[PDB]
């Protein structure tokens, strides 16, 4: 059976020193967690789990669990992983790289530095979180009240506004963009409202 998104673990003791450069060659975009060394282990006596890396590997096309497993073996050594699980929520796995996800936070796992995350081949978690249809409607309606409230005259004035106070309403630039897309028509109405409204004084 086939899918695009996988994760597996890389073990420092059975991967070459140029491993980080070697994953880069696969051409596939990857995100690699900070070195997960301080994982509380549930074996008796021993303090932390063997030291490991978590990798978020997104294939170009829909491929199988094993096509990856052997693509990585023949690239880092037959002994580097064995356990390739298929990833169901890319956003969630990316947050898991730092134990900062919903699953991991409720399991109180040892939170890592998101700055240690390594992005091979231009991973940007941003290109993997599109939004629920309802969400789109919800945000759009916020964009409305926003253009209303501050009498934003045009999509530049809107962007400038989001640039600053963005987070407060939970918009970014690249987000408004995905929100207003297709509703453009409706936008020109708002922006004319605002224009001819500010022309009143």
**Helices 133-149, 184-198: crossing angle, 10 deg rounding:** 10
Contact of residue 61 among a copy of itself, Mn ion, none (CB under 5-8 Å per partner type) = a copy of itself
- Taking the CA atoms of residue 32, residue 37, residue 38 and residue 41 in that order, the dihedral angle to the nearest 10 degrees is 110
85 sits in the region (left: phi over 0; alpha: psi -120 to 50; else beta) called: beta
Q: Which does 40 bind (CB under 5 to 8 A by kind): Mn ion, a copy of itself, none?
A: none
Residue with smaller CB distance to a copy of itself, 9 or 63: 63
Which residues touch 66 (CB under 8 Å, ≥6 apart)?
Answer: 84
Residue 41 sits in the site that holds a copy of itself (CB under 8 A): no
The interface region with a copy of itself, picked from 7-15, 38-46, 101-109, 111-119 by CB under 8 A, is 101-109
- Decide: is 5 part of the binding site for a copy of itself (CB under 8 A): no
Judged by beta carbon distances under 5 to 8 A according to partner kind, the member of a copy of itself, Mn ion, none in contact with residue 36 is Mn ion
Chain position whose Cβ is nearest to Mn ion = 36
Could you say whether residue 131 binds a copy of itself (CB under 8 A)?
A: yes
Q: Which ranges constitute the DSSP H helices of the chain?
A: 19-25, 65-76, 90-96, 102-106, 133-149, 155-169, 173-179, 184-198
Q: Binding to Mn ion (CB under 5 A): which residues in 26-55?
A: 36, 39
| Minimum distance from residue 201 beta carbon to a copy of itself (Å) | 13
Regarding 137 and contact with a copy of itself (CB under 8 A), the answer is yes
Q: State yes or no: residue 69 binds a copy of itself (CB under 8 A).
A: no
Q: Does residue 178 touch Mn ion according to CB under 5 A?
A: no
Is position 12 an interface residue for a copy of itself (rule: CB under 8 A)?
no
Close Cβ partners of 111 (under 8 Å, ≥ 6 residues apart) = 98, 99, 100
**How far is CA 153 from its chain centroid?**
32
Residue 141 interacting with a copy of itself (CB under 8 A): yes
Please identify which residue in the block is written with the tokens 């947050």: 95
- Residue 74 interacts with, from a copy of itself, Mn ion, none (CB under 5-8 Å by kind): a copy of itself
Residues 6+ apart with CB under 8 A from 71: 26
- Residues within the interface to Mn ion (CB under 5 A): 36, 39
């Amino acid at each position: 059976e086939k899918a695009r998104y996988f994760t597996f673990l890389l073990y420092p003791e059975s991967i070459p020193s140029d491993w980080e450069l070697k994953l880069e060659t696969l051409g596939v975009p990857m995100a690699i967690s900070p070195l997960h060394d301080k994982d509380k282990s549930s074996i008796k006596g021993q303090k932390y789990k063997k030291a490991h890396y978590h990798v978020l590997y997104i294939a170009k096309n829909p491929v199988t669990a094993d096509s990856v497993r052997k693509k990585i073996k023949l690239l880092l050594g037959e002994k580097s992983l064995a356990m390739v699980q298929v990833v169901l929520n890319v956003e969630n796995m990316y947050l898991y790289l730092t134990h900062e996800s919903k699953d991991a936070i409720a399991k109180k796992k040892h939170v890592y530095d998101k700055a240690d995350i390594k992005l091979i081949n231009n991973f940007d978690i941003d290109r993997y979180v599109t939004l629920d249809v309802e969400e789109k409607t919800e945000l759009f309606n916020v964009v409305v009240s926003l253009i209303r409230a501050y009498t934003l005259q045009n999509i530049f004035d809107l962007y400038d506004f989001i640039d600053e106070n963005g987070e407060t309403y939970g918009l970014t630039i690249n987000l408004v963009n995905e929100v207003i897309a297709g509703k453009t028509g409706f936008m020109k109405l708002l922006f004319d409202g605002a224009y001819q409204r500010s022309k009143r004084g």
